[model samples]
Target: SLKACIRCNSPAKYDCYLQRATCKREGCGFDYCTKCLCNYHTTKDC
Candidate 1:
């Protein structure tokens, strides 16, 4: 079952999944799906 991307709302890839992260901006916390997420945008510190 392919799911829509959390970021762009496009159809997610078969292996994509959701992930949690703390935004670099202060007091911003959210969960994001990996479907539309690119490697360059992922948090390197986590």
Candidate 2:
């Protein structure tokens, strides 16, 4: 399931050029897609 998106139901695009962030909250090792994570955190499109 590591190939799937962690937050959304959409199929993720692992282009490598896209930003990736690790979960610092619990060292969960989960990664967030750049646009989705930014959209969530800053409420703006990446």
Candidate 3:
């Protein structure tokens, strides 16, 4: 029901850990942790 963060290796949750964000760079189903998405991309609206 959830996915793991590639940065912190934590569960990407909306109510607990980092929220799930799918990368639309080239394809779908590519998810990233909230922190990683923000820190890595330097943005919060991924």
Each candidate structure's TM-score, on Cα atoms with residue i matched to residue i, is 0.25, 0.29, 0.27
lDDT order, best first, reads 2, 3, 1
Candidate 1's C-alpha runs over 4 A off are: 16-46
Encode model 1's per-residue lDDT on 1-46: one tens digit a residue: 5444444344333343344222332232334434334342446632
Total backbone collisions for each predicted model: 0, 0, 0
Candidate number achieving the greatest lDDT relative to the actual structure: 2
Itemize residue pairs with steric clashes in candidate 2: none
lDDT of each: 0.38, 0.45, 0.44
Candidate 3 lDDT, 1-46, residue by residue in tens: 4444454444444322445465433333345555545433335544
Question: Any idea what lDDT model 2 has?
Answer: 0.45
Q: Is candidate 1 or candidate 2 better by lDDT?
A: 2
lDDT of 1: 0.38
